Design a protein around this ligand. Structure first.
Ligand SMILES: [Zn+2]
Length: 27
């Protein structure tokens, strides 16, 4: 989840789909 991310890139509009696409935060 972009909300749980620590990157300034993913932190934009909260596009979780855009974050998980490159970041790890499944289940
Ligand atoms: Zn991220």
């Amino acid at each position: 989840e972009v909300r749980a991310c620590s990157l300034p890139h993913c932190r934009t509009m909260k596009n979780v789909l855009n974050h998980m696409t490159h970041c790890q935060a499944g289940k």
